[PDB]
């Protein structure tokens, strides 16, 4: 501890060779509200990092004829109005490596958890171009979210951009966390980008991750609501850069942009402060470009680039149910599918509050395994018929027996779509659940018993008949032998449950 | 000091001061304008530098009024970000946006000051302790259990509550609290400020016999104050609470009046600060201006700040930008419905809108969680049955929906409760209802054994024994 400081001083004095280079420099004219108009940076390029006399670092965004409008990644309190702004020549990279797994970082790829510092050797530009047409494939691998109503009705594949759009406090963050926890068995690197959130919310989310063990394969990019607008606007792009590193190294990744609406509002704030012409809801005309340039990075690579992929799960919050709002329409146009959450469904008890009648997935059944499509067909047909007859539920007594049967079937298929928070189901468990419900081996129980019977049944199968799990896992198809094992387990569990 | 400037322009609250070529203030410094009083006498006006204008000019929003202020007045750059007295010298005294006493007592000890601006606590120094403190109100004990050490929010227009609610919470908790309390009245009325001050002197909180034995520090900038003072009174009170959380390491109880006023004061000055208008008329920096102050409010793992904030929802537009950007910062929101105030379900708390993060089974207990879920489902089913009732007839309804409607009307009546601070409005004495009695009462109601009491037997009663007593009294009035 005595000579190490001296040898570090010696190595750091022998490292540099006193090199000289022409720097592009300028002087601050006016600074205020996170923007600086600086005079002199003539060779500066659009999107380049400039460094201020007081240590603040900013981006040269709009290059006008008289000055350079610069957004500050910090507080411009100490900027002097005459201080020297020296351009760095670089465009906004981050150091990237595998040592980020388990870490919490801000939009500068620097740790905010105080667990040390990431050793990173490679580097990647924050704004990197998306994969082209010829460096892509068709999305065919499923991305299991653990939510049965998602994986059966709105299936997500690896390389697909699915929108988690809903009202406030309907369960968007919950769906995102259940998917990150369900990625436990799979080798999917997960990325959660917290944009403009409260710091205690990010604290709870990351401690929940560490508890359930989903922190060994996850990275958390956090830009809370006290951050400058520039950092909350840059954070999803650093998340995308990290996931792109892992994607091009033949790994499958998952990225959740929680409240991309906050990124749109931050970008609108800095656009308005740079005095740019606004549009609808004062959003700049390139806010669609902001969102699309980010979402097109989520690709499924081309089997000569490595078969890797990056699934993107952006989260968009609607206000007063206005799906026709500006940013929701933008992201709905950009993304592959949409997953709508309803506050009426959330209040009525059905959680997660997925509105399947209005949720789409343009990828379709190609994002499913072969064992899931068989049972998902019947689930889809029966839930559709229930949605038809739902207005007739108050007149059920004076109706045909087939109509009463379809009404009861739908109203107890709705009970198995309910699911507690942070409890994602494995694909075999949800396949067996859909099979039982859709065939009608629970058309005898009471609705206050369907969920409990199904929990006991899933535990019973997973413990007593592991051959069903093995058949559905290895062959990925709903084999007749699996059907036999499942019918035997259903009979035996019905007897054990009627034993009370 | 050495940095003496001159007023260049006066436009309402915004004034830009011309300073020497090299020497200039920083953003968020305090400038002191040597003004003249109404009579012939020197007056002081404090300003706050907002932006550097480029020609040795800096825009500053004034804390006081600028009527009577000439161009070319000397301006003293204090070189500080507008410090504020903190510590025990503040407990029991009404303060100002500038930290000066306005309770017509002696001066305050400037020995321990703190600047009005600050950065939020780091991410490593945050709590993850998920607790619940009991308030005594049925509708928030059973539906949106407020978190101990968290940020609570009160939404609603003008005339639904949030002020009677915040006074009821003050009544119920500010003396049962161990640490100090801090009230910040941002852009609210002066009559309500004087009433709260008299009631705190009465309740033995101010302890007027000796002030330093008190546990509250009132900071106040009302509607009559300029937009620059309503914009910084929140940071003043927040700094006073930061000191009690950090240096004294005691649990602080921070009550805020309308934080909508903190945002609309910024939106008022923002046009004069040259900033271009954002969505419907707020400043382009609404989200960051909210976020700085909100993230500064935090339980920092060495002390906790429980923050109860009233958020004015303008024109009952719950999707207005100002409340929309607050929802994301609060922990347990509590929406107030004008539809319940219109019939007298005070506290007119919207049961299906008021959510909370403590209403989780592992935090709250399975009995509490399940009874809250059942109440919410019954109210939602009744709200969805509303139009099949309101036109097609309540008589033709099925057997299960008639029981749903009856039990939901009984639940709606039972959510109301008479407050101790609102016996001037309800004309009846107030009642404190513990959590267990709330759980037991709602479990009785939706059990089906209280199906015999009239609906009005559940109106404005404390607990379920009061409901049964009122039912008995109603039956007696109906018979003889």
């Amino acid at each position: 501890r005595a000579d190490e400081i001296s040898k570090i001083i010696r190595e750091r004095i022998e490292g540099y060779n006193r090199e000289v280079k022409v720097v592009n420099t300028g002087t601050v004219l006016q600074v205020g509200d996170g923007i600086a108009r600086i005079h002199g940076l003539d060779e500066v390029m659009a999107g380049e990092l400039v460094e201020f006399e007081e240590g603040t670092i900013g981006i040269a965004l709009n290059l006008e004829s008289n000055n350079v409008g610069v957004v500050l990644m910090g507080d411009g309190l100490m900027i002097q109005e005459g201080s020297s702004v020296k351009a760095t020549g670089r465009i906004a990279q981050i150091p990237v490596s595998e040592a980020y797994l388990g870490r919490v970082i801000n939009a500068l790829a620097k740790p905010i958890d105080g667990r040390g510092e990431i050793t990173a050797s490679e580097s990647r530009l924050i704004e990197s171009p998306a994969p082209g047409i010829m460096s892509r494939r068709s999305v065919y691998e499923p991305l299991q979210t653990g939510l049965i109503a998602i994986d059966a009705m709105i299936p997500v594949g690896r390389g697909q951009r699915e929108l988690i759009i809903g009202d406030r406090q309907t369960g968007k963050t919950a769906v995102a966390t259940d998917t990150i926890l369900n990625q436990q068995g799979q080798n999917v690197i997960c990325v959660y980008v917290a944009i403009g959130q409260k710091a205690s919310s990010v604290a709870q989310v990351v401690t929940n991750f560490q508890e359930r063990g989903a922190m060994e394969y996850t990275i958390v990019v956090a830009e809370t609501a006290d951050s400058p607008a520039t950092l909350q606007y840059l954070a999803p792009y650093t998340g995308a850069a990290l996931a792109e590193y892992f994607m091009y190294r033949e790994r499958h990744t998952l990225i959740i942009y929680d409240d991309l609406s906050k990124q749109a509002q931050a970008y609108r704030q800095m656009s308005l402060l740079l005095r740019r012409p606004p549009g609808r809801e004062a959003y700049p005309g390139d806010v669609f470009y902001l969102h699309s340039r980010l979402l097109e990075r989520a690709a499924k690579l081309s089997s000569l680039l490595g078969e890797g992929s990056m699934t993107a799960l952006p989260i968009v919050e609607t206000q007063a149910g206005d799906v026709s709002a500006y940013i929701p329409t933008n992201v709905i146009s950009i993304t592959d599918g949409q997953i709508f959450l309803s506050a009426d469904l959330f209040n009525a008890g059905i959680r997660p509050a997925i509105n399947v009648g209005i949720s789409v997935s343009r990828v379709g059944s190609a994002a499913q395994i072969k064992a899931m499509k068989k049972v998902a067909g019947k689930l889809k047909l029966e839930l559709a018929q229930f949605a038809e007859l739902e207005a007739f539920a108050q007149f059920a007594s004076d109706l045909d027996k087939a109509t009463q049967n379809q009404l009861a079937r739908g109203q107890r298929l709705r009970e198995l779509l309910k699911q507690p928070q942070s409890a994602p189901l494995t694909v075999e468990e949800q396949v067996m659940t859909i099979y039982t419900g859709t065939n009608g081996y629970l058309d005898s129980l009471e609705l206050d018993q369907v969920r409990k019977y199904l929990v006991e049944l899933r535990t019973y199968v997973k413990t007593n008949k592991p051959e069903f799990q093995e058949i559905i896992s290895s062959t990925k198809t709903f084999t007749e032998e699996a059907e036999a094992l499942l019918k035997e387990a259903i009979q035996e569990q019905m007897e054990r449950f009627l034993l009370q | 000091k050495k940095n003496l400037g001159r007023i260049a322009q006066i436009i309402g609250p915004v004034l830009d001061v011309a300073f020497p070529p090299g020497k200039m203030p920083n953003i968020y410094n305090a400038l002191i304008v040597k003004g003249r009083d109404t009579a012939g006498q020197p007056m002081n006006v404090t300003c706050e530098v907002q932006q550097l204008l480029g020609n040795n000019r800096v825009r500053a929003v004034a804390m006081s009024a600028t009527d009577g202020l000439t161009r070319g007045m000397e301006v003293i750059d204090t070189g500080a970000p507008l410090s504020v007295p903190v510590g025990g010298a503040t407990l029991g005294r009404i303060f100002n946006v500038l930290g000066e006493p306005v309770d017509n007592l002696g001066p305050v000890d400037t020995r321990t000051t703190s600047p009005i601006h600050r950065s939020a606590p780091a991410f490593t120094q945050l709590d993850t302790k998920l607790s619940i403190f009991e308030t005594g109100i049925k509708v928030v004990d059973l539906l949106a259990p407020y978190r101990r050490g968290g940020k609570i929010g009160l939404f609603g227009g003008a005339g639904v509550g949030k002020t009677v609610l915040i006074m009821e919470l003050i009544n119920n908790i500010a003396k049962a609290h161990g640490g100090v309390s801090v009230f910040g009245g941002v852009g609210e009325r002066t009559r309500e400020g004087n009433d709260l001050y008299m009631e705190m002197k009465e309740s033995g909180v101010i302890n007027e016999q000796n002030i330093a034995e008190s546990k509250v520090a009132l900071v106040y900038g009302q509607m009559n104050e300029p937009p620059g003072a309503r914009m910084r009174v929140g940071l003043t009170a927040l700094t006073m609470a930061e000191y009690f959380r950090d240096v004294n390491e005691q649990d602080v109880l921070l009550f805020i009046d309308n934080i909508f006023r903190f945002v609309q004061a910024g939106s008022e000055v923002s046009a004069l600060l040259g900033r271009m208008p954002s969505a419907v008329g707020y400043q382009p920096t609404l989200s960051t201006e909210m976020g700085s102050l909100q993230e500064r409010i935090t339980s920092t793992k060495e002390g906790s700040i429980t923050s109860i904030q009233a958020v004015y929802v303008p024109a009952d537009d719950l999707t207005d930008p100002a409340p929309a950007t607050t929802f994301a910062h609060l922990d347990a929101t509590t929406v107030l419905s004008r539809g319940l105030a219109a019939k007298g379900i005070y506290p007119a708390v919207d049961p299906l809108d008021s959510t909370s993060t403590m209403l989780q089974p592992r935090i709250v207990g399975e009995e509490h969680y399940e009874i809250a879920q059942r109440v919410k489902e019954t109210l939602q089913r009744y709200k969805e049955l509303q139009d099949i009732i309101a036109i097609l007839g309540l008589d033709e309804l099925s057997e299960e929906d008639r029981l749903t409607v009856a039990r939901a009307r009984k639940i709606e009546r039972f959510l109301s409760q008479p407050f101790f601070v609102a016996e001037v409005f309800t004309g009846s004495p107030g009642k404190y209802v513990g959590l267990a009695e709330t759980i037991r009462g709602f479990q009785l109601i939706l059990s089906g054994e209280l199906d015999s009491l009239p609906e009005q037997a559940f109106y404005l009663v404390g607990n379920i024994d009061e409901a049964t007593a009122k039912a008995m009294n109603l039956e007696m009035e109906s018979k003889l």
């Binding site: 007063a320 149910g321 206005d322 | 024109a315 009952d316 537009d317 719950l318 999707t319």
Partner: peptide
């Protein structure tokens, strides 16, 4: 809140 109450009336 006028558009939302219109949407709810339509619903």
């Amino acid at each position: 809140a006028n558009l939302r109450e219109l949407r709810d009336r339509i619903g």
